[PDB]
Amino acid sequence: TPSLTVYLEPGHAADQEQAKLIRSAIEHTTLKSVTIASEIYYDPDPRSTVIPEDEEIIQLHFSLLDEEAEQSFDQQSPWLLRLELDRAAMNDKDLTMGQVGERIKQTFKNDLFVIWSEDNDEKLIIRCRVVRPKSLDAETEAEEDHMLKKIENTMLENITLRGVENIERVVMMKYDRKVPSPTGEYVKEPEWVLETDGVNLSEVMTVPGIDPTRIYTNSFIDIMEVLGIEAGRAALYKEVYNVIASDGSYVNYRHM
Amino acid sequence: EAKKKVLDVTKEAQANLLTAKHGMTLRESFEDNVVRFLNEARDKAGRLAEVNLKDLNNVKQMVMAGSKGSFINIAQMSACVGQQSV
Amino acid sequence: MTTFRFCRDCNNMLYPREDKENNRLLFECRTCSYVEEAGSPLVYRHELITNIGETAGVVQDIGSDPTLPRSDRECPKCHSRENVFFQSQQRRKDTSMVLFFVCLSCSHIFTSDQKN
Amino acid sequence: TKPRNSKNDGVDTAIYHHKLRDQVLKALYDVLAKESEHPPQSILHTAKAIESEMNKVNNCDTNEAAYKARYRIIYSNVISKNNPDLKHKIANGDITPEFLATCDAKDLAPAPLKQKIEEIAKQNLYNAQGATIERSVTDRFTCGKCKEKKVSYYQLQTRSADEPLTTFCTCEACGNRWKFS
Amino acid sequence: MDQENERNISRLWRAFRTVKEMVKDRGYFITQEEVELPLEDFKAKYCDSMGRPQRKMMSFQANPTEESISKFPDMGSLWVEFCDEPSVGVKTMKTFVIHIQEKNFQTGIFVYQNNITPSAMKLVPSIPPATIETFNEAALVVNITHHELVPKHIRLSSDEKRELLKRYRLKESQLPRIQRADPVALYLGLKRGEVVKIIRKSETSGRYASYRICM
């Protein structure tokens, strides 16, 4: 069970909001996690549909597409990634529909274009239609489903909207620091910290909005690789002392 | 009274009214409440039974001297054993 | 909700195909000459997370199980006060502790959660 | 009689000889006048004001992406059938063009969606918290660090059964820990 | 003004400040005001009309202080240069090497953005006694030496090494050792066979001094 504890900046320590912004900026977010129904549907003629709900979204972009999109109307796949997206999950990560949904996704490989609605609709429906050249071979063009199921799986699994890799969860916690008060004595002062489930210390360290001089993890090999060997020695000492002293036993300092 | 508290929490949870605690499932919340209630009941009963005892009690004399036993032993032999776990 | 369709000739499931000159969808059997006309543009469906209400499962002859508890709650339909009650029989980790009651006489299912 | 629009009302939309501006003005004027009984002249003046504000707050020749995003946001808000009242207000002038220029996407939503949004935000903020390990409270043991008797306990049969149970006491005021056996 | 522009600008400014801190820590002469340059002045100077960061104008030459020269007579001037290309080509590396050689500089710092071709790094050790060291940009955003768990290290001269070796009556293969790839060793630029002193806090005596050798 590797882990990593992040301490926020002095200014943002006492307020929950900047803490939640940082927590969203650290956790790993991928498309498969944010779709309540990323349903593979038949999309033979994307011009019109039978479902009334997506019909409203149709005329929005059909009056909002550029001339190049008008030319590329025929590139949209005879199948659709029809995204009924959950409102709660999308708003949890502070994820704007348009910018995050399309900028990075089309920038990555120019592979998937989208007809997307503004967040105000009661049902967040995106139409993900992949873009391919018309120069595709006749045998290739016949096997629509064969390409698109594969690219749809590679689409859900391999697109990262936001976050850092290998960090499964990030969680908020409240701790009680001891600080010298202005009169000179020591007083108890609360603070907000972020505890993860998964370690990637090279990238979490550079995220703006945290304290890059009080970060620590219970995986001393990473500290050895990143910070040095004396830092690894200190972390190893903390680990050994913690495991010994968590049982109430006392062993003098020289031995350890 | 501890049994009544546990029964009331069970009644509340069986009507989908109970609220899941911070970052922790509903079932875990119910189990946590039950365990805490039962442990506090055992501790309080043990402390009552210990306060009852006179000064000429031999077990109390041994415990006070510091040679054998503690208040847990008195509680289990006199008040109640408690909640078995695995 | 996509449904499997079997060919009327050899019971094999029908694969989709397109008709370009008429631009219409058809279902064909790869083994025979049967072709049938598609009634909807919905052929396949892939949901991810299941928003399914918890179900009591099999109910037939559940009143003869003698290890199942009892209650004296009153039936909302036949006004009987004898019934069987049990928790949700679907074994998900996060299922709530919401009861289910099966009436003894009319075999009516209801829950202890009367949310409007 | 007929759906009011630029072609139906006979109102010229080519005033600044800009193709993008011309077509966006035509589209917004058509969608605004399609279901509005308000006289077309003030509608055209409001359209001119809002397009002038769009151009002045962001040049299309330098920020065409942001221009398109803003136009899409406003246009989608206008077409939104869930809240028709807005097309009254822009017709009535209740909503100032500068407000539409500066406002975010959330505020233009109707009241029920607003309320759902705050409820979702509150639920997420509650669901981002960690497990709180609240321990049994008692007032018998004395802590050695701060001497505040608010010291939690936990006792179990862990040592060999040749010896009695083992207790561990942790002070909830300072963080001290110790064991008794 | 897309968000990525100012994000990259801020990270680049962070890396610039960290590199200045490193050069100051290597014994050179850098003013405190230059270290604490606010990002507004950085944007005013090292950005074009479009806000593109002009890395090529950031290359600079540093000289050692009086104290460093007194402690290390062999120490000489240093040059640092940034590279604009996402990947460094062979010709760019050759040009940088030739520039360093004609300037007759003893050491140089070459900061690259994403990757370096193997043929480019083929030329790194080909210019004795000059030393060429590379620092990936993504690893210089945060200063490592400012952490709480990293004690303070110091470099030792030949005379100090000899005096310690005599006083403890040791042979250099018995001291504790520190690798080359150790991040603090790269920070200080320690070569093979150099001794670094460590100052540390201690529950038992307050302060304690250890020593290590670069192997």
| C74: DSSP letter | P
> Alpha-carbon distance C95 to B18, whole Å?
13
Where exactly are the structural domains of chain E? 2-142, 143-215
> Alpha-carbon distance E155 to E213, whole Å?
10
> Alpha-carbon distance E135 to D177, whole Å?
46
Using a 10 angstrom Cβ sphere, with 0-12 exposed, 13-18 middle and 19 or more buried, the burial of residue E4 is: exposed
Yes or no: say if E188 and E196 are a contact pair by the CB < 8 Å rule: yes
> Alpha-carbon distance E6 to E12, whole Å?
10
What is the phi/psi pair of residue E212, to 5°? Answer: -145, 160
Instruction: State how far the alpha carbon of C30 is from the alpha carbons of C6, C18, C93, in Å.
Output: 11, 14, 43
> Alpha-carbon distance E193 to D102, whole Å?
64
Task: Name the one residue in this structure whose structure tokens are 């709480």.
Answer: E148
Closest CA to A22 of A9, A4, A35: A9
Beta carbons of B23 and D129 less than 8 Å apart: yes
Say yes or no: D63 contacts chain A, CB-CB below 8 A.
no
Yes or no: say if A97 and A116 are a contact pair by the CB < 8 Å rule: yes
Residues of B in contact with C112 (CB under 8 A): 14-16
Within this chain, domains C2-46 and C47-116 share the same CATH topology = yes
Residues of E in contact with A222 (CB under 8 A): none
Task: Output the CA angle C52-A44-D27, nearest 5 degrees.
Answer: 95
Question: How would you list the strands of the sheet with C70-71, edge to edge?
Answer: C70-71, C83-87, C99-103, C109-110
* Cα torsion D44, D50, D56, D60: sign: negative
Residue E195 in tokens? 């001794």
What is the phi/psi pair of residue A58, to 5°? Answer: -55, -60
Closest CA to D67 of D49, D50, D44: D50
Closest CA to E21 of E145, E112, E134: E145
How remote is the C-alpha of B70 from its chain's centroid? 16
Extended beta strands in A29-168, E state: 29-30, 35-42, 79-85, 112-116, 124-130, 160-162
Yes or no: say if C29 and C10 are a contact pair by the CB < 8 Å rule: yes
Yes or no: say if A235 and A220 are a contact pair by the CB < 8 Å rule: yes
What is the phi/psi pair of residue A233, to 5°? Answer: -65, -45
How remote is the C-alpha of D117 from its chain's centroid? 7
The residues, any chain, with a CB within 8 Å of residue C90's CB and separated by 6 or more, are: C54, C55, C57
Closest CA to D77 of D99, D40, D105: D105
3-state secondary structure chain D: CCCCCHHHHCCCCCCCCCHHHHHHHHHHHHHHHHCCCCCHHHHHHHHHHHHHHHHHHCCCCCCHHHHHHHHHHHHHHHHCCCCCHHHHHHHHCCCCHHHHHHCCCCCCCCHHHHHHHHHHHHHHHHHCECCCCCCCCCCCCCCCCCCCCCEEEEEECCCCCCCCCEEEEEECCCCCEEEEC
Question: Side chain identity at D22, as an amino acid letter?
Answer: D
- Could you please state the CATH topology (level 3) that the domain comprising C47-116 is classified under: N-terminal domain of TfIIb (2.20.25)
Method underlying the structure: cryo-EM
The residues, any chain, with a CB within 8 Å of residue A17's CB and separated by 6 or more, are: none
Neighbours of E199 (CB within 10 A): 12
Instruction: State how far the alpha carbon of C9 is from the alpha carbons of A151, C5, C28, C29, E84, in Å.
Output: 34, 12, 11, 9, 68
Extended beta strands in chain E, E state: 60-62, 78-82, 87-88, 107-112, 115-116, 131-136, 152-155, 177-178, 195-202, 206-214
Yes or no: say if A9 and A210 are a contact pair by the CB < 8 Å rule: yes
The CATH number assigned to the domain with range C2-46 reads 2.20.25.10
Residue A98 in tokens? 């348009």
> Alpha-carbon distance E161 to E196, whole Å?
9
Where exactly are the structural domains of chain C? 2-46, 47-116
In a 13 Å sphere around the CA of A180, the CA atoms on its Cβ side amount to 3
> Alpha-carbon distance A54 to A57, whole Å?
5
> Alpha-carbon distance A14 to E21, whole Å?
30
Yes or no: say if A156 and A39 are a contact pair by the CB < 8 Å rule: no
| B18: DSSP letter | P
SS3 E200: strand
**Helix (H), strand (E) at residue C102:** strand C99-103
Name the CATH superfamily housing domain E2-142.
RNA polymerase, Rpb5, N-terminal domain (3.40.1340.10)
> Alpha-carbon distance A107 to A97, whole Å?
16
> Alpha-carbon distance A129 to A106, whole Å?
11
Instruction: State how far the alpha carbon of D35 is from the alpha carbons of A64, C60, D85, E161, in Å.
Output: 20, 57, 11, 90
The residues, any chain, with a CB within 8 Å of residue B7's CB and separated by 6 or more, are: none
Yes or no: say if D95 and D89 are a contact pair by the CB < 8 Å rule: yes
Instruction: State how far the alpha carbon of C57 is from the alpha carbons of C53, C61, C86, C102, in Å.
Output: 12, 12, 11, 11
Q: CA-nearest residue of chain D to B21?
A: D131
Instruction: State how far the alpha carbon of D71 is from the alpha carbons of A64, D19, D105, D106, E75, in Å.
Output: 9, 15, 12, 16, 62
In a 13 Å sphere around the CA of E56, the CA atoms on its Cβ side amount to 6
Using a 10 angstrom Cβ sphere, with 0-12 exposed, 13-18 middle and 19 or more buried, the burial of residue A194 is: buried
**Maximum distance among all Cα pairs of chain A, rounded to whole angstroms:** 83
Yes or no: say if A117 and A124 are a contact pair by the CB < 8 Å rule: yes
Say yes or no: C94 contacts chain B, CB-CB below 8 A.
yes
Strands E107-112 and C109-110, by their bridges, are unpaired
Is C7 annotated as belonging to a binding site? yes
Q: Which residues between 21 and 80 in chain B have a beta carbon less than 8 angstroms from any beta carbon of chain C?
A: 25-27, 30
Say yes or no: A41 contacts chain C, CB-CB below 8 A.
yes
Question: Side chain identity at C102, as an amino acid letter?
Answer: V
The residues, any chain, with a CB within 8 Å of residue B60's CB and separated by 6 or more, are: B53, B54, B74
Looking at domain E143-215, its CATH class is: alpha beta
SS3 C34: coil
| A157: DSSP letter | H
Question: How would you list the strands of the sheet with A169-180, edge to edge?
Answer: A169-180, A186-197, A4-7, A216-217
Tell me what percent of chain E is helix, strand and coil, each rounded to the nearest 5.
40, 25, 35
> Alpha-carbon distance E196 to E156, whole Å?
6
* B neighbour chains, 3+ CB pairs within 8 Å: C, D
Q: How many CB pairs under 8 A join A and D?
A: 69
> Alpha-carbon distance A124 to A118, whole Å?
8
